[PDB]
Design a protein around this ligand. Structure first.
Ligand code: 0FO
Length: 268
């Protein structure tokens, strides 16, 4: 209000309207996200808040693969969230629009940081439920990726989920066919979609039928080890998908660049 200077709108959509901001007390770059109360299906508590705020609080202690919630405010018709903002930054969707299919070395660095971020969320008892390139920010100076948009997420549990409101083209075929999925294995499928998107420059599937068929065609030259990983993540049966430990032990994942080296070699 007077604690923050509001800058340009960055984007708006199913997540709300997000503005560039600066915290007056120390000039910290922030993003200020406004979520309308009547456009929020899911609520939790600590008084009643969006699920998105409960999930963010649970993942927002120190480890930085997740954009942190610095503060939040309630308004009569909305909540307002003050999030971290890397500067300069570009979401991975725009980065891929610009660069096309990514060199494997860069995809490996990005994919690995995504897996550390998602493991962190899961250690904190939070399931994101909408992992995709549009929900990943690149801190271009440090080469660090950051998950954003917990607005479709949930407390992690070990029983079946029967609701979903994240992105359909990343949703697994057990969701498409049965409206049921378990959290980790759905997550792993979306991570196979994401990895394909990074190395091919676009998502493999556009239509329910392709998702259900689960047959993956590579339109770009991609190494056999990368194809094997992506195809393992996109196994039709949830329990044939790798755990995070098996993805990270996969031979395509070895020798990851550090974020800083990644920014130097690939980001300028
Ligand atoms: O939840 C979000 C959504 C965003 O779009 C976003 C953008 C920047 Br930049 C920084 C943090 C952000 O967090």
């Amino acid at each position: 209000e007077s604690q923050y200077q509001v800058g340009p709108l960055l984007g708006s959509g199913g997540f709300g309207s997000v503005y560039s901001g600066i915290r007056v007390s120390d000039n910290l770059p922030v993003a200020i996200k406004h979520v309308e109360k009547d456009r929020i299906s899911d609520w939790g508590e600590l008084t009643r808040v969006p699920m998105e705020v409960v999930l963010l609080k649970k993942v927002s202690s120190g480890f930085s693969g997740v954009i942190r919630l610095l503060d939040w405010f309630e308004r009569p018709d909305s909540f307002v969230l003050i999030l971290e903002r890397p500067e300069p930054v570009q979401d991975l969707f725009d980065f891929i629009t610009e660069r096309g299919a990514l060199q494997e070395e860069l995809a490996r660095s990005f994919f690995w940081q995504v897996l550390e971020a998602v493991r962190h969320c899961h250690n904190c008892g939070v399931l994101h439920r909408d992992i995709k390139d549009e929900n990943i920010l690149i801190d271009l100076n440090r080469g660090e990726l950051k998950l954003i948009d917990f607005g479709s997420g949930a407390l992690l549990k070990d029983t079946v989920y029967t609701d979903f409101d994240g992105t359909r083209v990343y949703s697994p075929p057990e969701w498409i066919r049965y409206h049921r999925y378990h959290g980790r294995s759905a997550a792993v499928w979306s991570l196979g979609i994401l990895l394909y998107d990074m190395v091919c420059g676009d998502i493999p599937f556009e239509h329910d039928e392709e998702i259900i068929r689960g047959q993956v065609f590579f339109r770009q030259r991609v190494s056999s080890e990368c194809q094997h990983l992506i195809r393992w993540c996109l196994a039709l049966r949830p329990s044939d998908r790798p755990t995070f430990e098996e993805i990270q032990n996969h031979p395509w994942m070895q020798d990851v660049l550090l974020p800083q080296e990644t920014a130097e070699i690939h980001l300028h």
